[PDB]
């Protein structure tokens, strides 16, 4: 269960960014992916959840209608697309893999289990 991330370079406000999380050591198609962020001087804040099938997904209120979450099982990759950023969006973004096998649509038993390396983003 090894998770890595890439992207999130120094980008000025109003531009678009793509973050790629790569996973290994398990079946990437049997788990629901989580995206979260850690802002300086603030507690961890959830960003979004994407189901393994991609049919069902949810976003946090702050980032709603200005972002996209996608997953490629064949390449075992997780893409986060951000557009129209702002000052507060600057944070270390993290990709997390649930351990519980997907067996329905509950989204409260699905845990933010072992974490990824995460990458900084500055707006």
């Amino acid at each position: 269960v090894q998770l890595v991330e890439s992207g999130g370079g120094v980008v000025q406000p109003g531009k678009s960014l793509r973050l790629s999380c790569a996973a290994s050591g398990f079946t990437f198609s049997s788990y629901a992916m989580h995206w979260v962020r850690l802002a300086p001087g603030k507690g961890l804040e959830w960003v979004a959840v994407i189901s393994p099938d991609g049919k069902n997904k949810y976003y946090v209120d702050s980032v709603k209608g200005r972002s996209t979450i996608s997953r490629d099982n064949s390449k075992n990759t997780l893409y986060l697309l951000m557009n129209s950023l702002r000052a507060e969006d600057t944070a270390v973004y993290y990709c997390a893999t649930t351990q519980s096998l997907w067996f329905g649509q509950f989204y409260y038993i699905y845990g933010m289990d072992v974490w990824g390396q995460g990458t900084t983003v500055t707006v």
Binding site: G43, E45, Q99, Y108, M112, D113, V114
Partner: protein, 107 residues
């Protein structure tokens, strides 16, 4: 952060320290709250899930419980190398994964 937590806590090494996480009835009640720890400059790790369970490789010192619209965590035999921020995260009934403000622990 709908959840509320004490700004910080500390104590001697080994008096069974406790940390309380408070939230409404739509975040930590009728759902589950998981507790993670964040080391300074290191990736967070899972400590307690489902309010009582524990993952492999985590010692028996950490324990957790829920008492209605609020949860608590207990660390017995605290060592000096447990400095980290403890976060309690629960699923809001509607769409959210509410996170706690944090708990800066010191020895």
């Amino acid at each position: 952060s709908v959840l509320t937590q004490p700004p910080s806590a500390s104590g001697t090494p080994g008096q069974r320290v406790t940390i309380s996480c408070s939230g409404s009835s739509s975040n930590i009640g009728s759902n589950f709250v998981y507790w993670y720890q964040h080391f300074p400059g290191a990736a967070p790790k899972l400590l307690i899930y489902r309010n009582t369970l524990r993952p492999s490789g985590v010692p028996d010192r950490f324990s957790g419980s829920k008492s209605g619209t609020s949860a608590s965590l207990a660390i017995s035999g605290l060592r000096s190398e447990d400095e980290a921020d403890y976060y309690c995260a629960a699923w809001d009934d509607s769409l959210f994964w509410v996170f706690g403000g944090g708990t800066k622990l010191t020895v």
